[PDB]
């Protein structure tokens, strides 16, 4: 009926069983407006919640905030309200030279460099998406005309040392993460982000269907600064694609 | 100069080397207004940033969002802009029956049930506050008239299974956390929250001073529910305390 953080009721969702979950609350309205009859439901913390209609079916759009902990609350409370399918959308940097700005990445599995995933399953468990959601996201991404990469994402509880960034206050990275970016590159890992391991582990171990798609807005290996136009296009394409993937999931 | 998430420059901080860091962006203005000349600087995602003046010195107030990952970004970027002291304030539940709603908890150490702390130090490293900050928080808390508890806090990357909550969609708690609340209770742990292990480990291993103070708004072992008035009073007291603790640090 009611939940602790999101500030919405089951009735507010109008029967929605699918949610699109961007990280940034400011993206929620933009995603909702790509669909029919978008309606603002609530805003509390990093959780801005909208409802809309896609081919006549109710869909929820709910922001997650940054990182696994924030995400885990949103996913749990949406599930309490009857949501069973979760589509993560965002933009990301790439760490493979062959991945270009404007390409899309659909995560087939996540390196669990997080903590919240361990609150749902031990480390041996794979942070893997639902096959139907990954399939729908691949299809929507390819149909957009983008170049699409299916592969592993490294999911870090930090933006800085866990992504082996040295341009920081201390300039230090803990032993665990020293040399780690080259390690992941050599293992074929496509990109870093900060929520997929928690999202995918939590869902795959809880009877929920989840997947992640993202537009590439920077490549860590390519200093060339992308153009504002290509970036705007990439942001817009990522949410168009996640909406099309949701359409493919509706039953 | 320029930071990636907070949307502020070093110049915006007007020389501040101390930040008060609540979790909820909505608390930021409320803290800032207890000080002189509060000014809104920026808002992006869960990061709302104000500057103010305390006894003639610039102070920053910056929300952190929920959880260690979100907190770690804020702390790092504030440190890039010259901030060296971080005072966490909030409200919390308690897991010890002797801790009452309205009491204050000052964290002396955190059980590291998070992941972000491990991005700064291996698990053997203690998630411990700066002694001066914890001392200032204790003093400010006592001076407010509150009953104060110094002790260990369990810092969880989740609100639900990591705090051994079963009233959930699956009703399941992973093996690691089954029985864990009783375990921490028997070890004298005062409360659960979701950011302190990351904050304290990050700061203690990076040459930054940090501490945490929180007003108790519910007790998990008690059936009594606090009215809306007691909650507001506890929230108001918690931020009054953190500003007075900041005064003591400056």
CATH topology of chain A: Rossmann fold
Which structural category do the helix and sheet elements of chain A fall into? alpha/beta
Oligomer: homodimer
The SSE string of chain A, one letter per element, is: EHEEEHEEHEHEHEH
PDB class: transferase
Keywords: Structural Genomics, uridine phosphorylation
Assembly: dimeric
Entry title: Crystal structure of Uridine Phosphorylase from Vibrio cholerae O1 biovar El Tor
Fold and architecture overview:
The structure is a homodimer. With 251 residues, chain A is of the alpha/beta class. The first copy, chain A, has a single domain (1-251), classed as 3-Layer(aba) Sandwich (Rossmann fold). Helix content of chain A is 27%, strand content 28%. Chain A contains 6 helices and 9 strands, in the order βαβββαββαβαβαβα. Chain A has a 5-stranded mixed β-barrel with strand order 5-8-7-6-9. In chain A, strand 3 (47-54) and strand 4 (57-62) form a beta hairpin. In chain A, helix 2 runs parallel beside helix 5 and helix 3 (131-143) crosses helix 6 (228-249). The longest helix of chain A is centred in the last third of the chain and has 22 residues, at 228-249. The first copy, chain A, is globular, with a radius of gyration of 17 Å. The two termini of chain A are 24 Å apart. Chains A and B meet through helix 2 of A and helix 2 of B. Chain A: Its EC number is 2.4.2.3. Chain A: Pathway: Pyrimidine metabolism; UMP biosynthesis via salvage pathway; uracil from uridine (phosphorylase route): step 1/1. Chain A: Homohexamer.
């Amino acid at each position: 009926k009611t939940v602790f953080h999101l500030g919405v009721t089951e009735a507010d969702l109008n029967g929605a069983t699918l949610a699109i979950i961007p990280g940034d609350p400011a993206r929620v309205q933009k995603i909702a407006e790509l669909m029919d009859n978008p309606v603002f439901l609530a805003s509390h913390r990093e959780y801005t919640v909208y409802r809309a209609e896609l081919d006549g079916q109710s869909v929820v759009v709910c922001s997650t905030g940054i990182g696994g902990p924030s995400t885990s609350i949103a996913v749990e409370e949406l599930a309490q309200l009857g949501v069973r399918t979760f589509l993560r959308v965002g933009t990301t940097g790439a760490i493979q030279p062959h991945v270009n700005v404007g390409d899309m990445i659909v995560t087939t599995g996540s390196v669990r460099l997080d903590g919240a995933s361990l609150h749902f399953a031990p480390m041996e468990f794979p942070a893997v998406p639902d096959f139907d959601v990954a399939t729908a996201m691949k299809a929507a991404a390819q149909e957009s005309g983008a170049t699409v990469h299916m592969g592993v994402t490294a999911s870090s509880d930090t933006f800085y040392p866990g992504q082996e960034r040295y341009d920081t206050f201390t300039g230090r990275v803990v032993r665990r993460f020293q040399g780690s970016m080259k390690e992941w590159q050599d293992m074929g890992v496509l990109n870093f982000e900060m929520e997929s391991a928690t999202l995918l582990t939590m869902c795959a171990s809880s009877g929920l269907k989840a997947g992640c798609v993202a537009g590439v807005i920077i490549n860590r290996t390519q200093k060339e600064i992308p153009d504002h136009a290509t970036l705007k296009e990439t942001e817009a394409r990522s949410i168009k694609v996640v909406v099309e993937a949701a359409r493919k999931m509706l039953k």
